[PDB]
Design a protein around this ligand. Structure first.
Ligand SMILES: O=[N+]([O-])/N=C1\NCCN1Cc1ccc(Cl)nc1
Ligand SMILES: O=[N+]([O-])/N=C1\NCCN1Cc1ccc(Cl)nc1
Ligand SMILES: O=[N+]([O-])/N=C1\NCCN1Cc1ccc(Cl)nc1
Ligand SMILES: O=[N+]([O-])/N=C1\NCCN1Cc1ccc(Cl)nc1
Ligand SMILES: O=[N+]([O-])/N=C1\NCCN1Cc1ccc(Cl)nc1
Lengths: 207, 208, 208, 208, 209
């Protein structure tokens, strides 16, 4: 028998927040998916947008696993007691603002899920935002210090209303949201850094 | 039998701020209620409001209980010493700005109460704010990671004037406030998250 | 003869920043007095105002007293090492911006003083600020979690220059200040919470 | 011999950040000098200024001294590991914004230097900023909780250009800066607090 | 056996984040380079600019070195677990805002690399921003408390592209960027402080004639 006080106590005795949980030599698989909740500010001249989205993140950590046959197989743990992917938005022009409790969910099998709601300003193409076709703002999010051999980032291609949780009170509306995978190399070093290109096709409303 | 100093020592020895106090296997019953204090900024064009309010939060944590027959049955404790529910306004567009000292009240029977004054910005229906019927802006508050099996949220029952604490110097006024309970499920997972929907009907003040 | 180091060390070893220094079962008599130093942002439309003031607070904790016949009878101690009254401005719409070092003064007889300079925004009656009688903004401050039986606030009694330290460069001027005591209760609970109501009667200085 | 690691380690073990290094009974001698870097915002209507300046502070703490014959005679230390004068700008309307690494310099003789670049807003005379005479904003800096007997402040006795490190891109320019020594006293208590009055005579650079 | 955990563990036991890694007794060589990403607000009247850039910093700390013949030769460590140059922009009017996770890259040969994306506001010459030649904003970055005998800062002047990483959606375009090493002394004290003068020449896009 075991409770939540133990599941956490154990996570503390095993988790290494500062050490990436690289199973064997295989890189840590990190899935990234953004759920656009709102579009607060847009500047058709400076090409900047202020958005609110849930940055759904999922990865795995073996050392945190535990037998949940007689205890819960999931618990909410502060991200501070857990290693977290140093994901970053390459084209963000403001520090990320986390609007929610910074708590992740850990499953008895090492599965970890973190989904904070974030408000952030980005630098992207805002042209055509006031037309029927709308504009497309691409946001590149991927690890900042871990390359392909250490961390890998893949989106979540599937069926889902790109504006399922989008505020109906926004002055904008979402037309389409596609998230593809890609890599980023630099004119210095050979190693590339996997990322996810989230393409946001939105437009201003007009009755 | 003891003093406030002792009471505090035991709490810090038994309390587990990072572990939900799920008595048995049932969810923790958290009550939420919002006492609107002020309505500062409104924008019918962007549908954003800036509101000040007290977030009456109450729940139970039996592990904190102590003998109060001959000792104080109530003490003030830093929330950082107690487990606190991970509530979040769903339509909030700014993190909550706590205006008051982050102190909770704990009773001998383990009942906990925390009522901080908060100033937050929400995204909601502001249309009609300058009309006689006013606008109805709805705010949804509930746990962020704990579903219905772990935390249950319900509004506090207490029929009183909605603008009983509402500043008479605000540019707007409260026509009515109704706090209902609801559940939000996400297309992926069968877990439902309980929340409270506080609908604030307010308008701009006029004259004649 | 004890030095300032031995004095602090003794304070640190006996003071409990999270435990109210209650003697017996009598409330801790806290003194609150505001010294308005400046008045900046003002809006008669939104009924808000930016104000800078010294929140001269004082109370006692006899457990910290020491013999100063041949030693310093006062030291500057970091408020984080001491228990400080959890006071808040009920009608404030921004958290207090403490401009000065967060240091208190502990006196050999257990007396404690804390006088931080603060800039904060308030929602009060700003109407008439541009008239001869000016405007009258009232600020309510008091304990946020401790009720009358645990804490009691009483404004310092002494006729002082209401603008003794007020900035001459401010676009405004103070007509008069009245610090009256007051009590507040809620339609939920019996216990009351004492507070101080400071009435700042100020007006905009006329160039003619 | 002893490398930097040893010196820095020794300081961290003997530093008493909350106790004033008062040699004997004579107060701690603190020297302050403001080296203006820029004038960003100025409002003659509200008498406010936003400026950037290097607040050079100098004092001694013999306890930190060491033998630097065959070792480093100066090391950089975080001001958090050391005691620091609780200086305040009596007429500031915003808390100081330290823009530079909060590191100090500790010389082997126990001399401590702390020169942080700060941006802060003040409430002073701006009238004339647009004339050939220019405006004369006066800034009072001094200890906030230590009086003459515990802490003394004196401007660095020197004669250097008042615009040496002033930005050439600023819309304004400095006519002259005088750093006079002064003191303050409050109607209640006999103690006096030593300060420094920095008078900044500046004006807007005309279109020529 | 030595995985990432150990590499980090030992780094925490032999690393003093507040003690500058002065090998022998010579000064620490810090290489500073800026990679401009975007130019936001620009006020020609007040002469101020909001810029975004990656501050590529590189130096060596031997107390961190380790054998990498049969183990990882690189890891990511929080900058708080190690020593970092106290660089500062002398003409900054706002504290640096770090947008990206604050982690450094540590190689087994003691080599340390820190490249944070920073958003900072500066006071410089903005005149001519809306002209063909454009404006030239100079940003001075160097150590704040370590003089030339303790820290030497030299830019990594390598034949690269200046607007290589600059956002294409910015209202401005980079005409040229030059990073010249320099020193700053004061009419009070003998010590000289090394720095890097980064001159950014830019102008508004889409002008006429
Ligand atoms: O499954 N979901 O879509 N969940 C979800 N969307 C918004 C909030 N939320 C609950 C949740 C679930 C797990 C974690 Cl780590 N955080 C939050
Ligand atoms: O409405 N109330 O019941 N109480 C209340 N409103 C403002 C201050 N206050 C007292 C109080 C009591 C307990 C706690 Cl944890 N916080 C606040
Ligand atoms: O009015 N006073 O008596 N004192 C006073 N006003 C502003 C600063 N000051 C000195 C002081 C005295 C005591 C404490 Cl705890 N802090 C500061
Ligand atoms: O003497 N100075 O003017 N020094 C100086 N001006 C700008 C930077 N700098 C170096 C310095 C040296 C020592 C300390 Cl504690 N702080 C800063
Ligand atoms: O330009 N680069 O060489 N590298 C680079 N640009 C953006 C991210 N990145 C990789 C990186 C590598 C090492 C560190 Cl400490 N930070 C970042």
């Amino acid at each position: 028998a075991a409770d939540r006080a133990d599941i956490l106590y154990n996570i503390r005795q095993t988790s290494r927040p500062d050490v990436i949980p690289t199973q064997r030599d295989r890189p840590v698989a990190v899935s990234v998916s953004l759920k656009f909740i709102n579009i607060l500010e847009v500047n058709e001249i400076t090409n900047e947008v202020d958005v609110v989205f849930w940055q759904q993140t999922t990865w795995s950590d073996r050392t945190l696993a535990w037998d949940s046959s007689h205890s819960p197989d999931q618990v909410s743990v502060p991200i501070s007691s857990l290693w977290v992917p140093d994901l970053a938005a390459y084209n963000a022009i403001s520090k990320p603002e986390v609007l929610t409790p910074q708590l992740a969910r850990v499953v008895s099998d090492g599965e970890v899920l973190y989904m904070p709601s974030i408000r952030q300003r980005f630098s992207c193409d805002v042209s055509g935002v006031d037309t029927e076709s709308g504009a497309t703002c691409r946001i590149k999010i991927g690890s900042w210090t871990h390359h392909s051999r250490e961390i890998s980032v893949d989106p979540t291609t599937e069926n889902s209303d790109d504006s399922e949780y989008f505020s109906q009170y926004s002055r904008f509306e979402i037309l389409d949201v596609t998230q593809k995978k890609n890599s980023v190399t630099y004119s210095c070093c050979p190693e590339a850094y996997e990322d996810v290109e989230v393409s946001l096709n939105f437009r201003k409303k007009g009755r």
